[PDB]
Amino acid sequence: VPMHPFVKALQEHFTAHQNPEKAEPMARYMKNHFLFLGIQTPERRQLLKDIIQIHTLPDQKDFQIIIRELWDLPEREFQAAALDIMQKYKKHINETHIPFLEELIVTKSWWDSVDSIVPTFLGDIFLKHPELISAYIPKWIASDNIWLQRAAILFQLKYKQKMDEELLFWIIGQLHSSKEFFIQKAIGWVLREYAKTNPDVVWEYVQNNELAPLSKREAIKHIKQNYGINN
DNA sequence: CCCGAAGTCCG
DNA sequence: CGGACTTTCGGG
Ligand SMILES: Cn1cnc(N)c2ncnc1-2
Numbered sequence: 001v002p003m004h005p006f007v008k009a010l011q012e013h014f015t016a017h018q019n020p021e022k023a024e025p026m027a028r029y030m031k032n033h034f035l036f037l038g039i040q041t042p043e044r045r046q047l048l049k050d051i052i053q054i055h056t057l058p059d060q061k062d063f064q065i066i067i068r069e070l071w072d073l074p075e076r077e078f079q080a081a082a083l084d085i086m087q088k089y090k091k092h093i094n095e096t097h098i099p100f101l102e103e104l105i106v107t108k109s110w111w112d113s114v115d116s117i118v119p120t121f122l123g124d125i126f127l128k129h130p131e132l133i134s135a136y137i138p139k140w141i142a143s144d145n146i147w148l149q150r151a152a153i154l155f156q157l158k159y160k161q162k163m164d165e166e167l168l169f170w171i172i173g174q175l176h177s178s179k180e181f182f183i184q185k186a187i188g189w190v191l192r193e194y195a196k197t198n199p200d201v202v203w204e205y206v207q208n209n210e211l212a213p214l215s216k217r218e219a220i221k222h223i224k225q226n227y228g229i230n231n
Numbered sequence: 232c233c234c235g236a237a238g239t240c241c242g
Numbered sequence: 243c244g245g246a247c248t249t250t251c252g253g254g
Pocket residue numbers: 236237250
């Protein structure tokens with residue numbers, strides 16, 4: 001079965017505007033885990049727009065198919081395009097898509113893809129269906145996969161006043177001993193972000209609970225100005 | 232335009 | 243460790 005024509009068209013159009021000179025530092029930035037075509041985000045978005053203008057966005061029945069086919073292509077720009085495309089089908093995504101989103105998190109995994117999947121798409125789903133959190137988060141925490149663990153930490157990143165504090169701190173407590181950089185940093189990030197909403201609770205937490213030095217330092221990067229640094 | 236959010240380099 | 247800096251991106 002041939003590649004979906006929309007994907008084939010995107011592949012052709014991206015490839016015609018590839019930039020090998022730019023591709024080398026872009027690939028190095030991601031620790032050479034991926035090939036790159038060398039197309040940065042402003043141009044990449046315009047080339048996608050070009051293809052939508054000519055071909056129109058595929059019927060929703062092909063949504064998951066399109067995403068998978070782009071996910072399977074070697075160059076990283078195709079996963080970036082896939083996430084742009086998924087945003088265009090946002091109003092069709094619901095709680096039944098959690099396993100589909102899971103599979104995206106654990107394939108071609110790195111911080112760029114996982115950070116674009118988790119606080120937005122998964123975050124919105126669990127905000128609407130908080131009863132489903134306990135069907136997934138304990139498995140993610142227990143998994144060997146650091147990107148599922150990072151997802152458990154970051155899905156609440158944008159919740160602000162809707163943050164489930166008890167849940168957040170329980171998750172962090174489960175992962176605080178991790179020696180993985182991307183876990184320590186994710187803990188630091190979610191705490192720093194939540195501190196913008198509730199600085200007192202974050203300050204109390206970091207002063208009275210074990211964290212990696214990296215996590216604590218990232219957590220209080222801003223609020224240490226409000227509380228001061230004791231001699 | 233502005234600010235806030237991985238990577239290298241060096242002490 | 244972790245500060246000083248890098249370029250890119252999201253969002254205002
Ligand atoms: C991706 N990226 C680029 N530049 C910075 N200064 C950053 N801080 C966090 N993430 C960053």
